[PDB]
């Protein structure tokens, strides 16, 4: 039909290109001194030039990951600790959105009831006794493969789409509905949006309270995004101007923005999570190419 | 004009004694119509 | 029990160009360098 | 697909298609992000009829999506969307020497333009933004912010006396100038945060630094130090001398204050610092085409 | 794309063993150029022959990072990193790598006890230190503090305050910053940086006060009185030589703002520290770590 034949030719070309990236031709002469299992393995001879996603295996005590052992795809945070044992300790996004100040009291106490044990209480006391937040805890990546052992194993994706293996049921970032906002002239402007995470502090006369925002925007340029964010955040910025000079705690800014990665506009869908019956409204990004940039601070 | 005609159409070989000092001639602009490209240029495949 | 009966699907009906009666207005010709054509034109020479 | 096809709506001429054969390998921005483009969204002319403000063109040019010209067949026009960190060949349009190794930004075209030679076809032009080094990009942005700070000072003929001295700059044996800045309100917000951060540098500047001026003047002597003394002697709206500079056990407070001062300087730098779009490796001897390894 | 480096002199067997110890390391390279001599390899052609710490931070930002891959009989295979892909780095610096850390390149500290990993006939090999970003900020601030207080005299606590500056600690690994008493071994002298910082902190109040006179009476509300407070709190007693002042030969104010914005893009090198590597996993015993490359 002078159309479908060229179509099938392009299909076979992409299939054979995947096979070229996956398997390697062997030029070892193969003298025939082998058993059939080693035969078929030396004929196939995989390599891992196929997945193209960057993961990290992770050990974390199972007390902290209370609903996040059930719903794959969550932001994870590294919390270095002055104890020499678990020098690093890994923190849920919702676990730190507990004492974020953006979250209303109902959602805060609901996920606190999802987050009440002794280990969590001690870790939250550690986080509060830390002076600032953003460089004693840190952004780490996206959850996939909860194991739930004794000390549970987590895979975590640094770059690429979020999937364990076999490229099935490619998970998505799950953001709490309260903690995000899209400062833009028009929400969902033309096409795929970059997702950023903003840490913003606040000072209610005693101490510092941190706040966790997620912005979704068509702007790629970090200068444009911090220019729209000062426009959004100018009030508490002036309050901080009052605060940072009388303060003696070693911090130097109002907040910091960092890129998570790409999303898709038609792949934003609403929903809720539930753990022990606690319905909690979330906005689920579906397919994400995780692209971490540097932290960019703004005062 | 006609530069892709030069670079595509079949040509007539010439004496190497004639093609001698081309570099300095092209540099000091002895000719009036010249087009020189340093890299391998795909400007001769976009036929319109 | 909880039976599921037969599973049904649609037939996408198929559209040839020349079956539709817009092709009586049309006149369709393949020309493998129409991507490379800049401008086709026709000339009419009228006398009064 | 990684290929955007432009198709012009208006017809063209053979001199025009020869000009487009000359203009190959130039970065052209598109807003559309579709697999097809047309002549309406190609280039920067669909925005440079709205108020012609250089800051406005610069902001929306930051918003634009850049592509590279390739393979002009017929009326069609391929634009490759160039991938991150890969190598691409760029023909240059900025009147500059283009020394290798430096970073590049993408700047609005300077409005000294004479003869839309590349194109002008049926109430449509091909407004191509220039590519420049980041140093002169920051230089232009310093000029913009400074004209904000001076056009604040409402005058008659002093505006002209400042602008005709300021605007013509020379970087690497090339004179450029940018005319007709009506100094809209959008520059005022961009400059307000500079004013704020300079106020915080004032407030959080430690006792070591303003003392370090006078200590360096008393200990050593050099030409930079002479010009800095000329600045400090010429300006006299400040004098708030703090008498005691002993710094007994002040070390962690000094570290905290200097960290804050550095962060304010980083903020004001992030005001005028434009995003590096290209990194040059190999340059032709003409300085007409050069290779880069980058995308933002 | 890879790069072959051919050495200039002969090599000892102990030198070949040093290369086999250091078969994975970052090396900066000036020219994106395929065949490079060892006279142009490394950072010692730039440090200890040129300007000190400001030019060094700028050039270390602008050079081509490139990691060692494999050593042949006498040649070095150097692979340059592609963005968005992983690479692998061996642990030269003292500070322990951990997972999920951002990494950057600082210029090396002035250590003559470092054993100058190769010292091949008046040429030596110097590497930048791969270091976490929080340390890079802390080292930058400690270095600037040493360079600021080293010029001051007649402090009777000067030795102990320089020692309390030089001693930094991070995850139980101590180091002493070698910018002690001004030994001048490699002070890096940071004089342009310190002059630029202090011109910012001196010229800023005058420029902001001039701006504070005009374009504020109704709409510059959040700006004016907030700047009155920032200026007022610290500089509570300003304008002591005034009364023959508060003028502007508007070209003069023009020169003020132009110079004070010049100094900021001069101190652009101390502005940011980009994340050259994001380490994902770390091998056992902290010998090397597999990272990903960015910027």
Q: Are D142 and D134 in contact (CB under 8 A)?
A: no
Which residues of chain E form beta strands (DSSP E)?
A: 2-6, 26-29, 35-37, 64-71, 75-79, 86-90, 102-106, 119-120, 123-124, 129-132, 167-170, 173-176, 277-282, 288-293
Of A190, A191, A248, the CB nearest to D256: A248
Please give the sequence-ordered ranges of beta strands (E in DSSP) within chain A, or none if there are none: 54-61, 75-80, 88-92, 137-146, 151-160, 174-176, 194-202, 209-217, 255-262, 268-275, 278-285, 289-291, 296-298
CB pairs under 8 A between B and D: 27
Q: CA distances (Å), B25 to each of B29, B30, B38, in order?
A: 6, 5, 16
User: Collapsing DSSP states into helix, strand and coil, what is residue E42?
Assistant: coil
SS3 content of chain D, % helix, strand, coil (to 5): 40, 15, 45
Q: What φ, ψ does residue E176 adopt, rounded to 5°? A: -110, 125
Q: Cβ of C39 and D73 within 8 Å?
A: no
Backbone conformation region of residue A108, classed left if phi is above 0, alpha if psi is from -120 to 50, else beta: alpha
CB A235 within 8 A of CB A276: no
The distance of A57 to chain E (nearest Cα, Å) reads: 8
Q: Report residue A163 as tokens.
A: 């999937």
Tokens coding D40: 């309406």
Instruction: Give the gyration radius of chain E's Cα atoms.
Output: 24
Please enumerate in sequence order all residues whose Cβ is within 8 A of that of A148, keeping only pairs 6 or more positions apart, or say none: A62, A69
How many Cα atoms sit within 13 Å of A289 on the Cβ side? Answer: 7
| E295's tokens | 């910027």
Q: Does E61 touch chain D (CB under 8 A)?
A: no
Tell me how crowded residue A149 is: count the other CB atoms within 10 A of its CB: 9
Q: What angle do CA C26, C32, C35 make, to 5 degrees?
A: 90
DSSP, collapsed to helix, strand or coil, labels residue C34 as: coil
> CB contact, 8 Å: C32 with chain D?
no
Answer for the pair E67, E79: CB distance below 8 angstroms, yes or no: yes
CA distance B45 to E222: 61
For β-strands A54-61 and A151-160, DSSP reports them as antiparallel
The Cα D20–Cα D6 span in angstroms is 13
> E230 and D188 in contact by Cβ < 8 A?
no
The residue among A228, A216, A225 whose CA lies nearest residue A288 is A216
Task: Say if the Cβ atoms of B47 and C36 lie within 8 Å.
Answer: yes
Physical contact, B and E (3 or more Cβ pairs within 8 A): no
Beta strand pairing status for E288-293 and E86-90?
A: antiparallel
Other Cβ atoms less than 10 A from the Cβ of D135: the count is 15
* Strands in D110-176 per DSSP E: 130-133, 169-170, 175-176
Contacts with E209 from chain D: Cβ below 8 Å: 237-238
Q: Residues D44, D29: contact at Cβ < 8 Å?
A: yes
Quick count: other Cβ atoms within 10 Å of Cβ A198? Answer: 24
A153 touches chain E (CB under 8 A): no
The residue of chain E with its CA nearest to that of D139 is E262
Sequence-distant (6+) residues with CB within 8 A of D222 are none
Return the half-sphere exposure (C-beta side, CA atoms, 13 A cut-off) of residue A223: 19
Give the separation between CA E190 and CA E270, rounded to whole angstroms.
11
Dihedral sign computed on CA atoms, order D107, D113, D115, D121: positive
Displacement of CA A221 from its chain's centroid (Å): 20
D276 in Cβ contact with D105 (< 8 Å): yes
The reported resolution of this PDB entry, expressed in Å, is 9.0
Q: How many CB pairs under 8 A join B and C?
A: 4
DSSP E18: H
Q: In chain D, which residues have their Cβ closer than 8 Å to the Cβ of E201?
A: 201-202, 205, 209-210, 261
Distances (CA, A) of A100 to A140, A205, A295: 18, 16, 19
Strand segments (E) across E38-128? 64-71, 75-79, 86-90, 102-106, 119-120, 123-124
Q: Beta strands E35-37 and E2-6: pairing type? A: parallel
Tell me which residue of A169, A47, A53, A135 sits closest to E280, measured CA to CA: A53
Pairing of strands A174-176, A278-285: antiparallel
* Contact criterion met (CB < 8 Å) for D71 and B39: no
Angle at D26 between CA D133 and CA D135, to 5 degrees: 5
Cα dihedral value D208, D209, D214, D215, nearest 10 = 50
Closest CA relative to residue D132, chosen from D171, D168, D81? D171
CB-based contacts of A290: which residues, under 8 Å, 6+ apart? A141, A142, A157, A158, A159, A160, A161, A162, A260, A261
Q: Which residue, among A218, A215, A207, has the nearest Cα to A249 in the 3D structure? A: A207
What are the C-alpha distances in Å from E40 to residues E7, E8, E147?
10, 10, 30
Residue identified by tokens 């710490």 is E53
Closest-CA distance of chain A to residue E139, Å = 15
CB contacts of D253 in chain E (<8 Å) are none
**Cβ of E90: how many Cβ atoms within 10 Å?**
17
Any chains having at least 3 CB pairs less than 8 A from chain A are D, E
The shortest C-alpha distance from E280 to chain A (Å) reads: 6
Residues pairing with E175 in the sheet:
E168
**Residue C22: partners with Cβ closer than 8 Å, 6 or more residues away:** none
Chain B adjacent subunits, 3+ CB pairs under 8 A: C, D
Residue E271: left (phi > 0), alpha (psi -120 to 50), or beta? alpha
User: What is the Cα–Cα distance from E227 to E221, expressed in whole angstroms?
Assistant: 10
Strands across the sheet with E288-293, in order? Answer: E86-90, E288-293, E277-282, E102-106, E129-132
Put simply, whether E161 touches D (Cβ < 8 Å) is: yes
């Amino acid at each position: 039909m002078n159309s479908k034949s060229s179509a099938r030719a392009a299909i076979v070309d992409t299939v054979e290109a995947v096979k070229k990236r996956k398997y390697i031709s062997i030029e070892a002469g193969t003298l025939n001194n082998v058993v059939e299992k080693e035969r078929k393995f030396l004929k196939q001879f995989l390599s891992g030039r196929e997945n193209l996603r960057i993961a990290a295996r992770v050990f974390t005590p199972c007390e902290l990951l209370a609903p996040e052992l059930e719903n794959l795809g969550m932001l994870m945070y590294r919390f270095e600790t002055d104890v020499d044992n678990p020098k690093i300790l890994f923190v849920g996004l919702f676990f730190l959105c507990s004492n974020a100040f953006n979250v209303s009291a109902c959602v805060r106490t609901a996920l606190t009831t999802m987050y009440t044990n002794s280990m969590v209480d001690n870790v939250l006391s550690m986080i509060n006794t830390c002076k600032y937040l953003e460089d004693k805890v840190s952004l780490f990546g996206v959850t996939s493969l909860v194991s739930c052992g004794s000390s549970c194993l987590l895979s975590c994706v640094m770059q690429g789409n979020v999937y364990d293996a076999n490229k099935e049921n490619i998970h998505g970032l799950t953001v709490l509905k309260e903690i995000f906002l899209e400062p833009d002239w028009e929400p969902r402007q033309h096409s795929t949006q970059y997702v950023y995470v903003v840490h913003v502090y606040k000072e209610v006369l005693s101490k510092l309270q941190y706040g966790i925002y997620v912005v979704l925007t068509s702007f790629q340029n970090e200068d444009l995004v911090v220019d729209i964010l000062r426009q959004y955040f100018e009030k508490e910025r002036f309050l901080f101007l009052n605060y940072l000079i009388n303060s003696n705690t070693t911090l130097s800014y109002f907040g910091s923005v960092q890129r998570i990665g790409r999303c898709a506009t038609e792949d934003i869908k609403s929903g809720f999570l539930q753990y022990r019956g606690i319905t909690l409204p979330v906005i689920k990004l579906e397919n994400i190419f995780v692209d971490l940039s540097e932290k960019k601070v703004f005062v | 004009e006609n530069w892709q005609a030069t670079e595509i159409l079949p040509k007539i070989e010439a004496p190497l004694n004639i093609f001698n000092d081309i570099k300095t001639y092209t540099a000091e602009q002895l000719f009036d119509n010249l087009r020189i490209y340093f890299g391998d240029d795909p400007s001769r495949y976009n036929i319109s | 029990f909880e039976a599921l009966l037969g599973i049904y699907c649609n037939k996408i009906e198929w559209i040839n160009f020349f079956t539709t009666p817009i092709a009586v207005a049309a006149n369709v010709i393949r020309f493998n360098d129409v991507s490379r054509m800049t401008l086709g034109k026709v000339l009419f020479f009228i006398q009064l | 697909m990684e290929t955007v096809y432009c198709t012009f709506d208006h017809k063209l001429s053979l001199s025009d298609i020869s000009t487009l054969c000359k203009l190959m390998n130039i970065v052209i921005p598109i807003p559309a992000h579709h697999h097809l483009i047309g002549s309406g969204n190609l280039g920067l002319y669909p925005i440079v009829s709205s108020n012609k403000d250089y800051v406005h063109i610069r902001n929306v040019l930051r918003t634009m999506v850049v592509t590279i010209l390739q393979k002009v067949e017929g009326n069609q026009l391929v634009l490759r969307k160039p991938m991150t960190g890969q190598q691409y060949a760029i023909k240059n349009t900025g009147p500059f020497p283009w020394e290798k190794g430096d970073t590049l930004t993408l700047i609005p075209p300077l409005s000294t333009h004479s003869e839309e030679k590349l194109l002008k076809l049926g109430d449509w032009e091909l407004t191509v933004p220039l590519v420049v080094p980041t140093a002169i990009a920051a230089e232009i942005n310093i000029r913009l912010l400074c004209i904000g700070l001076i056009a604040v000072h409402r005058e008659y003929n002093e505006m002209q006396t400042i602008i005709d001295e300021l605007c013509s700059i020379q970087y690497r044996d090339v004179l450029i100038k940018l005319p007709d800045i009506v100094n809209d309100k959008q520059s005022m917000y961009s400059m307000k945060t500079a004013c704020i951060s300079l106020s915080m540098i004032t407030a959080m500047a430690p006792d070591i630094v303003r003392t370090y001026i006078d200590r360096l003047t008393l200990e050593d002597h050099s030409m930079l130090l002479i010009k800095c003394q000329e600045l400090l002697s010429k300006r006299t709206t400040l004098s708030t001398q703090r008498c005691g500079q002993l710094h007994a056990t002040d070390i962690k407070d000094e570290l905290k204050k200097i960290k804050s001062v550095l962060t304010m300087i980083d903020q004001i730098n992030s005001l005028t610092n434009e995003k590096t779009y290209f990194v040059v490796c190999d340059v032709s001897a003409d300085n007409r085409m050069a290779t880069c390894i980058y995308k933002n």
